[PDB]
């Protein structure tokens, strides 16, 4: 409607075909479009409409910063930021938000340091972060009665932060970290130390490149088979593995991967009135010249978070003044930024990725467990953070021995 | 006399509060360069500055104001490594030269990533041959490292790893933290680490040494190597984030070693400004409101002074300055070439620009004895000259070992 005023949102993500991660931005845009379509058809924000503007970060620090600066200088009066996919770009934007009183919601940045509310107070994310695996691993350790573990961490911020977070999760729980090992470019010395300390259950935090080196060292040290359990990050590319390949595969057999769950397994009606299964089919029907993105559900729910936040930001009997304050926003109003921040903090609805709720800007969501079984990653379980419950899928998880390994 | 503008960032607080003395040092240099008829007769160098608080988030707001508001700036002058990394990465988008007076980050030597960047501050890699020389002197082949994860420190440790490997020395344990060193320090104690290199800003140093006190990771068998840029009474300052008292902190830091770079010419010669190192110090002291020992950036102030001279001389050679625009490479390329060929005598010695190291040959080595720093030596890595005062002190009269040696 010509009389319907816009509620402008600064969309920041990689979109260009020139960069590999452009596929993520392009891949979530059908999910975003479906959320926007339904929100408008329902006129949930009446008499307003959600005006999402898109700016290409090109997954590059310099282009991302200029895209943000140019959106401020030349674009409409944005009320919040939606996006940030590449961690370095997301961090540059997220740390600066207070300078323009902008609340940000990311649907894809998972690195742990973004949970720091002193550095990123105005940052929120619908996707569970890398640290969210630690309460899930605790429930897995309790489930198989593993009371003694060793840790193997790559000495890089995103991994050392997950490892440091682990100590706090295991505290007051009856689990010993008998050996802590760290490496920069060669894990073999650290793997040799874990073997020497008779560690059986290994919690790994390292990148995709280092994982092949880690499993090659485990093979050389015979740190695999019925006596061992490796629990590592589950966010690596599918078929990341494809040491001789056969030897690498022998050491990898049965490793457990831990990552966020892309969509809810529950067949319950979400805020859109659609179940996650019905949403998934509509998403695959809407996307045309793009491959699917594992963050599409997080982007879809992310739009619902923004709409619900805006609806709450407008819930006052001081209606004309609140609408005028929104119309007047030009990045300098600390009060409106506070109203929006408080509204987002109250988020609590059932989304396509499960119950959407935040704890200090961090998503309380679902974690998926996979197990490597003959060159295939098989889903074996789900951990729900709100309920703090683990569900192991019957007849999936397998152990090379007659029983799961003993922690000693 | 056309106006020509410098957009500068000065850290008045935060990680390194260098702006406290570097801003007056820059103002002293601008007066001297301007009142010189033979340098830029047809131009007047003007300063537009902001307090970065050594914070990339706050610097992002000020970088926007510098770039998107008239007058056009010909050069950007940041201080801190984190702020310089952000503005040097972004500057290519505005074809702007970046000149830092304070950034030690070894990663800033990467010309592909920072193609318009120059610095008068040496690379932090200069500490590493001195650390290696001392490890050899004291016969240590096993070292541990603990770093806070700002790229300045991580890239210093990447360089140290190469230098130790070359000398037949191993880093046997590594730990890192973003803000909380509690887990890294506990792990160093459990691993029985003896010789430890700790890389972090002064604020994090207090958090580290409170954990060092609690874990008893100090005493006869432990040797800490730190960066010598902190205030002399750094461990004596009240800190709400630490529970440790002044007396507990004082005992935790006893006997530690520090390395720093000699930034002021020790010889009584007169540089391009016609000042001696000694008169520069009295002149800067004349401008300061607190004593040198009470002003952040005092040791770095000669570099700030010399950066203005370096820029002034480079502008003189290129001579069309009113016509600089952010969309034109022409003037940028010419000033880059003039900076690249800089060769003059400053208050910090012979000023030249070649990416990787950032010139001058000497480090100063100190030891904390009875709560006060004492000079123990100097090292020149170019000629391999360790000048030793014989003023170092150790419990029992000799340094400890890097490990037990008696388990047959
Ligand atoms: C944010 O939400 C939490 C959880 O409901 C609440 O405890 C907290 O007070 C809220 N923050 C505010 C209102 O500042
Ligand atoms: N000498 C100034 C330099 C500033 C920086 O590189 O951010 C510095 C480096 C390291 C430390 Cl710990 C403190 C200051």
From Swiss-Prot, chain A:
Tissues expressed in: Highly expressed in brain, especially in cerebral cortex, thalamus, hippocampus, frontal, occipital and temporal lobe, occipital pole and cerebellum, followed by corpus callosum, caudate nucleus, spinal cord, amygdala and medulla. Weakly expressed in heart, testis and skeletal muscle.
Subunit structure: Heterodimer of GABBR1 and GABBR2. Homodimers may form, but are inactive. Interacts (via C-terminus) with ATF4 (via leucine zipper domain).
Family affiliation: Belongs to the G-protein coupled receptor 3 family. GABA-B receptor subfamily.
Residue pairs linked by disulfide bridges in the UniProt entry: 59-86, 188-217, 216-243
Reported disease: Neurodevelopmental disorder with poor language and loss of hand skills: An autosomal dominant disorder characterized by psychomotor developmental stagnation or regression. NDPLHS manifest in the first years of life as loss of purposeful hand movements, loss of language, and intellectual disability.
Primary gene name: GABBR2
Function: Component of a heterodimeric G-protein coupled receptor for GABA, formed by GABBR1 and GABBR2. Within the heterodimeric GABA receptor, only GABBR1 seems to bind agonists, while GABBR2 mediates coupling to G proteins. Ligand binding causes a conformation change that triggers signaling via guanine nucleotide-binding proteins (G proteins) and modulates the activity of down-stream effectors, such as adenylate cyclase.
Shown residues within the full chain: 50 to 466 of 941
Effect in UniProt of substituting residue 69 to A: Impairs interaction with GABBR1. Decreases signaling via G-proteins
Protein name: Gamma-aminobutyric acid type B receptor subunit 2
Residue positions with a glycan: 41, 330, 345, 394
Swiss-Prot record, chain B:
Disulfides per UniProt: 54-80, 210-244
Distribution of this protein across tissues and organs: Highly expressed in brain. Weakly expressed in heart, small intestine and uterus. Isoform 1A: Mainly expressed in granular cell and molecular layer. Isoform 1B: Mainly expressed in Purkinje cells. Isoform 1E: Predominantly expressed in peripheral tissues as kidney, lung, trachea, colon, small intestine, stomach, bone marrow, thymus and mammary gland.
Binding site for baclofen: 81, 104, 121, 201, 300
Glycan-linked positions: 243, 274, 316, 328, 340
Compartments it resides in: Cell membrane; Postsynaptic cell membrane; Cell projection, Dendrite
Primary role: Component of a heterodimeric G-protein coupled receptor for GABA, formed by GABBR1 and GABBR2. Within the heterodimeric GABA receptor, only GABBR1 seems to bind agonists, while GABBR2 mediates coupling to G proteins. Ligand binding causes a conformation change that triggers signaling via guanine nucleotide-binding proteins (G proteins) and modulates the activity of down-stream effectors, such as adenylate cyclase. Isoform 1E may regulate the formation of functional GABBR1/GABBR2 heterodimers by competing for GABBR2 binding. This could explain the observation that certain small molecule ligands exhibit differential affinity for central versus peripheral sites.
Subunit structure: Heterodimer of GABBR1 and GABBR2. Homodimers may form, but are inactive. Isoform 1E (without C-terminal intracellular domain) is unable to dimerize via a coiled-coil interaction with GABBR2. Interacts (via C-terminus) with ATF4 (via leucine zipper domain). Interacts with JAKMIP1.
Protein known as: Gamma-aminobutyric acid type B receptor subunit 1
Lineage: Eukaryota, Metazoa, Chordata, Craniata, Vertebrata
Residue span relative to the full protein: 167 to 576 of 961
């Amino acid at each position: 409607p010509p009389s319907s005023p816009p509620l402008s949102i600064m969309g920041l993500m990689p979109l260009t075909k020139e960069v590999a991660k452009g596929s993520i931005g392009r891949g979530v845009l059908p999910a975003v479009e479906l959320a926007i379509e339904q929100i408008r058809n329902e006129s949930l924000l009446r008499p307003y409409f959600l005006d999402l503007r898109l700016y290409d970060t090109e997954c590059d620090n310099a282009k991302g910063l200029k895209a943000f600066y140019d959106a401020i200088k030349y674009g409409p009066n944005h009320l919040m930021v939606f996006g940030g996919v590449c961690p370095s770009v997301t961090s540059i934007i997220a740390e600066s938000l207070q300078g323009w009183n902008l609340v940000q919601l990311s649907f894809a940045a998972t690195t742990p340091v973004l949970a720091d509310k002193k550095k990123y107070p105005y940052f929120f994310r619908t996707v569970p972060s890398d640290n969210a695996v630690n309460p899930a691993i605790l429930k897995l350790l309790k489930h198989y009665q593993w009371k003694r573990v060793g840790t193997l961490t790559q000495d890089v911020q995103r991994f050392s932060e997950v490892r440091n977070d682990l100590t706090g999760v295991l505290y007051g729980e009856d689990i010993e970290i008998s050996d802590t090992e760290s490496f920069s470019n060669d894990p073999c010395t650290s793997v040799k130390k874990l073997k020497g300390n008779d560690v059986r259950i290994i919690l790994g935090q390292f990148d995709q490149n280092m994982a092949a080196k880690v499993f090659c060292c485990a093979y050389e040290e015979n740190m695999y088979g019925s006596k061992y359990q490796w629990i590592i990050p589950g966010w690596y590319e599918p078929s990341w593995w494809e040491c001789l390949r056969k030897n690498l595969l022998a050491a990898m057999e049965g490793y457990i991967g831990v990552d966020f769950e892309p969509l809810s397994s529950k067949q319950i009606k979400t805020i859109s009135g659609k179940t996650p299964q019905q949403y998934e089919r509509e998403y695959n029907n809407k996307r045309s010249g793009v491959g699917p993105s594992k963050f599409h559900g997080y982007a879809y729910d992310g739009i619902w978070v923004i709409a619900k936040t805006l609806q709450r930001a407008m819930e006052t009997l001081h209606a004309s003044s609140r609408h005028q304050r929104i119309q007047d926003f030009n990045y300098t109003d600390h009060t409106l930024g506070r109203i929006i921040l408080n509204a987002m903090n109250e988020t609590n609805f059932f989304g396509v990725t499960g119950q959407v709720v935040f704890r200090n800007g961090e998503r309380m969501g679902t974690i998926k467990f996979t197990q490597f079984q003959d060159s295939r990653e098989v889903k074996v379980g789900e951990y729900n953070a709100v309920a703090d419950t683990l569900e192991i899928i019957n007849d999936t998880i397998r152990f090379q021995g007659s029983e799961p390994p003993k922690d000693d | 006399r056309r106006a020509v503008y410098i957009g500068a960032l000065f850290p008045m607080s935060g990680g390194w509060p260098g702006g406290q003395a570097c801003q007056p040092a820059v103002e002293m240099a601008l007066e001297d360069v301007n009142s010189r008829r033979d340098i830029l007769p047809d131009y007047e160098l003007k300063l537009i500055h902001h307090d970065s608080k050594c914070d990339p988030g706050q610097a992002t707001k000020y970088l926007y104001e510098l770039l998107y508001n008239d007058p056009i700036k010909i050069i950007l002058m940041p201080g801190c490594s984190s702020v310089s990394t952000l503005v040097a990465e972004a500057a290519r988008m505005w074809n702007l030269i970046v000149l830092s007076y304070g950034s030690s980050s070894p990663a800033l030597s990467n010309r592909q990533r920072f193609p318009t960047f120059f610095r008068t501050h040496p690379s932090a890699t200069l500490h590493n041959p001195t650390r290696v020389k001392l490890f050899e002197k004291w016969g240590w082949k096993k070292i541990a490292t603990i770093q806070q994860t700002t790229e300045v420190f991580t890239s210093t440790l990447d360089d140290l790893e190469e230098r130790v490997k070359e000398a037949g020395i191993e880093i046997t344990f590594r730990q890192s933290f973003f803000s909380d060193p509690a887990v890294p320090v506990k792990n160093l104690k459990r691993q029985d680490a003896r010789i430890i290199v700790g890389l972090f800003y002064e604020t994090e140093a207090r958090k580290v040494f409170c954990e060092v006190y609690k874990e008893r990771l100090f005493g006869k068998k432990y040797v800490w190597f730190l960066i010598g840029w902190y205030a002399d009474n750094w461990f004596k300052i009240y800190d709400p984030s630490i529970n440790c008292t002044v007396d507990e902190m004082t005992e935790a830091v006893e006997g530690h070693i520090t390395t720093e770079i000699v930034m002021l010419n020790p010889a009584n010669t007169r540089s391009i400004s016609n000042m001696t190192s000694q008169e520069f110090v009295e002149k800067l002291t004349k401008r300061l409101k607190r004593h040198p020992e009470e002003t952040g950036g005092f040791q770095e102030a000669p570099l700030a002074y010399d950066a203005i001279w370096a820029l002034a001389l480079a502008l003189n050679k290129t001579s069309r300055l009113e016509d600089f625009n952010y969309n034109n490479q022409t003037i940028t390329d010419q000033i880059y070439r003039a900076m690249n060929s800089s060769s003059f005598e400053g208050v910090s010695g012979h000023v030249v620009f070649d990416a990787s190291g950032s010139r001058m040959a000497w480090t100063l080595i100190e030891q904390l004895q009875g709560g006060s720093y004492k000079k123990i030596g100097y090292y020149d890595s170019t000629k391999d000259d360790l000048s030793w005062s014989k003023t170092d002190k150790w419990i029992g009269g000799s340094p400890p070992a890097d490990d037990y040696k008696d388990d047959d």
